[PDB]
From a paper:
Covalent flavin was discovered in Complex II of the mitochondrial respiratory chain1 where it is attached via an 8α-N(3)-histidyl linkage. Integral-membrane Complex II enzymes can act in either aerobic respiration (termed succinate:quinone oxidoreductase (SdhABCD)) or during anaerobic respiration with fumarate as the terminal electron acceptor (termed quinol:fumarate reductase (FrdABCD)). In their mature and fully assembled forms, both SdhABCD and FrdABCD can catalyze the interconversion of fumarate and succinate at flavin adenine dinucleotide (FAD) covalently attached to the flavoprotein subunit ([name] or SdhA). Here, we stabilize the [name] [name]-[name] assembly intermediate via site-specific crosslinking and determine a 2.6 Å resolution crystal structure. This study identifies that [name] stabilizes a conformation of the [name] subunit that enables autocatalytic covalent flavinylation.
The structure contains the [name] [name] subunit bound to covalent FAD and crosslinked with its assembly factor, [name]. In evaluating the global architecture of this [name]-[name] assembly intermediate, the [name] binding site is located on a surface of the [name] subunit that interacts with the FrdB subunit in the assembled FrdABCD complex. The structure contains two global conformational changes as compared to prior structures of the mature protein: the rotation of a domain within the [name] subunit, and the destabilization of two large loops of the [name] subunit, which may create a tunnel to the active site. Interestingly, there are two copies of the [name]-[name] assembly intermediate in each crystallographic asymmetric unit; one in complex with the dicarboxylate malonate (50 mM in the crystallization conditions) and the other in complex with the carboxylate acetate (100 mM in the crystallization conditions). Both the malonate-bound and the acetate-bound [name]-[name] assembly intermediate induce a rotation of similar magnitude (10.6°–10.8°), yet the rotation angles of the capping domain are subtly different, such that the capping domain rotation differs by a 12.1° rotation between these. For example, the new position of the capping domain alters the position of the catalytically important FrdAT244 so that it is not poised to stabilize the transition state. Of the direct contacts that stabilize the [name]-[name] assembly intermediate, particularly noteworthy is a hydrogen-bonding interaction between the carbonyl of SdhEG16 and the N(1) atom of FrdAH44, where the latter is the histidyl ligand to the FAD. N(1) and SdhEG16 suggests that in the unflavinylated [name], FrdAH44 is deprotonated and carries the lone pair at N(3). This interaction also rotates the imidazole ring of the FrdAH44 histidyl ligand by 23° as compared to its orientation in assembled FrdABCD complexes. Bound dicarboxylate, represented by malonate in the structure of the [name] [name]-[name] complex, may organize the active site side chains to optimize the covalent flavinylation reaction or contribute to proton shuttling.
Author numbering:
A (entry chain A): 0 to 49, 58 to 103, 130 to 495, 497 to 576
B (entry chain B): 6 to 84
């Protein structure tokens, strides 16, 4: 166990973590900042991403788009610090694919700061907490096999969403919930985890995401009969072929277009395909000349992953799990219950997104709140004093043991299979619409799967195994999955991304459920729920 | 030498399906220092690796543009 004494450690080197690291280098130029990532940061999910004329119109559309589960004071902060962070990004070199341009700029800016020590290709296994205050973490160095103690008095979780918990998914296999997992291990609740958001056109089997631009440039969605079925679900009259209008038909509200898919499924109107049920995003009527100019990548994309030339046949699509509104619970400073420990970016719940993320508030949260979390954690690194050395070191030792008990564990279960059944149960029981019976089937399956998890075989693929890390991820996924399902099952209303079919729970219920779902995990392994109020300041519910 | 398995996890879901199973099903097939381009090419930006696979452009070191052909063609005979 090599060790490294830092002021702050940041777990995650995507948009949020990088912005946090720059923020901490600029706040205290004498700081040692450990910036840790299991992938070269330029491979963080943030690379993959592709009005505000008024603070009021933006605050209103975030709260309402989040169906009144937003922390309004956080929203007010956010909306008002958006222009600053956009300016600061352009100054840093970003020319005015937006997630790559963002991450590249953050990454190049981070290179100017000798305060920021990157720990590339390091897997963080646990955080060290004693007397209600974080004191560092312990990571594994992939590229060598060794384990590193990293001691800091503030730790910022920036680990990304909990996506790859659904079997069909838009996220890189990276995005496994590790940071939400670690918060749970230490009694920090996950908040509002029941609110997962789907993107309506994703490729079957893969989950690779077909851009809205497909429909902006006039592609239609039909069922098995070639019917543009969106007209049957409140989405205005059918618009002419080649003249779409925003908010109508294929450009309709993104949530209603997913729900439409589901209804078409229940009607018998889908197409049964290998690895899913699909409709068709049809682009044949554009022409390759249109398809080559605008939407140029989309052709090879379809040839490559669905084996379709979109000029000759339509593309199979279906709603895919995409963004997780919930995450580690944080206050208005991004600080968790555990003093000194922060969370920011997709892994957190700062109270910005409520029950439904609004547009590109996801990318801007990275730099607004990455800055805040960075500043705030610097502040708290300078005022924590020191900690009961034996306990910290004892805990750091316990990770070492726990990790060796894990290797050559007594068991014969296959983590691959355990992983896929969790994925299937997520799709079935926590999808577009939920029912108390499809949720309880899946709550059960997870319980069954996490028992088998206790007996998974990490075979001696040796230094330290890739198989062992994929297993630690699976564990993390499993615990956050129950948190989702338990919270969904228990939320007896329909709000934003969380939509229920059963009587009693089809309507939004502000008298009873204008509340956050906090999901704890006790040492015994069971999932405990709690609720907190929702800071309403300017905008009481409609 | 099994750490190149870890240089296969990408931020884009697209490269997980284009690079990870090609490393699995093959790689140990045509090796020697023709794998001198595999590792060399993994040390490149994720958009470039998505794009040079969709032929929205071509990589510079055309020793690496050959490797983009071997990954396209060997995968167009896969599934
Ligand atoms: C998946 C996705 C998301 C997305 C999108 C397209 C796709 C395919 N398009 C978007 C768009 O057009 N507009 C938008 O506003 N959002 C869009 N999104 C969502 C958005 O991209 C993400 O929510 C956002 O990028 C999240 O970024 P964040 O900075 O919070 O985190 P990250 O990029 O996922 O990276 C997390 C980092 O943590 C490291 N990590 C994770 N676990 C560990 C462990 N255990 N140890 C060490 N490091 C860890 C990762 O390496 C990563 O760097
Ligand atoms: K989030």
């Amino acid at each position: 166990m090599q060790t490294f004494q830092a002021d702050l450690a940041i777990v995650g080197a995507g948009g949020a973590g990088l912005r946090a690291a720059i923020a901490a280098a600029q706040a205290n130029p004498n700081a040692k900042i450990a910036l840790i990532s299991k992938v070269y940061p330029m491979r963080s999910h943030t690379v993959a991403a592709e009005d505000h004329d008024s603070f009021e119109y933006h605050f209103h559309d975030t709260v309402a788009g989040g169906d009144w589960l937003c922390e309004q004071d956080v929203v007010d902060y956010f909306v008002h610090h958006c222009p600053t962070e956009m300016t600061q990004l352009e100054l840093w070199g970003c020319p005015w694919k937006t997630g790559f341009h963002m991450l590249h700029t953050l990454f190049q800016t981070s290179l100017q700061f000798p305060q920021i020590q990157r720990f590339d290709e390091h897997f963080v296994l646990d955080i060290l907490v004693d007397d209600g205050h974080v004191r560092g973490l312990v990571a594994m160095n992939m590229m060598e096999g060794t384990l590193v103690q990293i001691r800091a008095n503030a730790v910022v979780m920036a680990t990304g969403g909990a996506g790859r918990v659904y079997r069909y998914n838009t996220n890189g296999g990276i995005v496994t919930g590790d940071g939400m997992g670690m918060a749970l291990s230490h009694g920090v609740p996950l908040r509002d985890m029941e609110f997962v958001q789907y993107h309506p056109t994703g490729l079957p089997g893969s989950g690779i995401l077909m851009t809205e631009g497909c429909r902006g440039e006039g592609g239609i969605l039909v069922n098995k009969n070639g019917y543009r079925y969106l007209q049957d679900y409140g989405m205005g009259p059918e618009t002419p072929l080649g003249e779409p209008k925003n908010k109508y038909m294929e450009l309709g509200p993104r949530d209603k277009v997913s729900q439409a898919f589901w209804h078409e499924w229940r009607k018998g109107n889908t197409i049964s395909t290998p690895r899913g049920d699909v409709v068709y995003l049809d682009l044949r009527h554009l022409g390759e000349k249109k398809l080559h100019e605008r939407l140029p990548f989309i052709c090879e994309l379809a040839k490559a992953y669905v084996g379709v030339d979109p000029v000759k046949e339509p593309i199979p699509v279906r709603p895919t799990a995409h963004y997780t509104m919930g995450g580690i619970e944080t206050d208005q400073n991004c600080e968790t219950r555990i003093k000194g420990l922060f969370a920011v970016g997709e892994c957190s719940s700062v109270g910005l997104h409520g029950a439904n993320r609004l547009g590109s508030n996801s990318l801007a949260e990275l730099v607004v709140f990455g800055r805040l979390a960075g500043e705030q954690a610097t502040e708290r690194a300078a005022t924590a004093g020191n900690g009961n050395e034996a306990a910290i070191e004892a805990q750091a030792a316990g990770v070492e043991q726990r990790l060796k008990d894990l290797v050559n564990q007594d068991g014969g279960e296959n983590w691959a299979k355990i992983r896929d059944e969790m994925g299937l149960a997520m799709e079935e029981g926590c999808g577009i619409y939920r029912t108390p019976e499809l949720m309880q089937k899946t709550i059960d399956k997870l319980a069954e799967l996490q028992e088998r998890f206790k007996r998974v075989r990490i075979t001696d693929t040796s230094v330290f195994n890739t198989d062992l890390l994929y297993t630690i991820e699976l564990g993390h996924g499993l615990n956050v999955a129950e948190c989702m399902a338990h919270s969904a099952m228990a939320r007896k209303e329909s709000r934003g991304a969380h939509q229920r079919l059963d009587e009693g729970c089809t309507e939004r219920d502000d008298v009873n459920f204008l509340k956050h779902t906090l999901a704890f995990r006790d040492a015994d392994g069971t999932t405990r729920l709690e609720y907190s109020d929702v800071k309403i300041t300017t905008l009481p519910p409609a | 030498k099994a750490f190149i398995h870890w240089a296969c996890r990408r931020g884009m879901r697209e490269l997980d399906i284009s690079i990870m199973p090609f490393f699995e099903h093959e790689y140990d097939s045509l090796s020697d220092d023709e794998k001198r381009i595999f590792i060399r090419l993994l040390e490149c930006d994720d958009p470039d690796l998505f794009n040079w696979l969709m032929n929205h452009g071509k990589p510079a070191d055309a020793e690496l543009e050959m490797m983009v052909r071997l990954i396209q063609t060997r995968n167009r005979e896969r599934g």
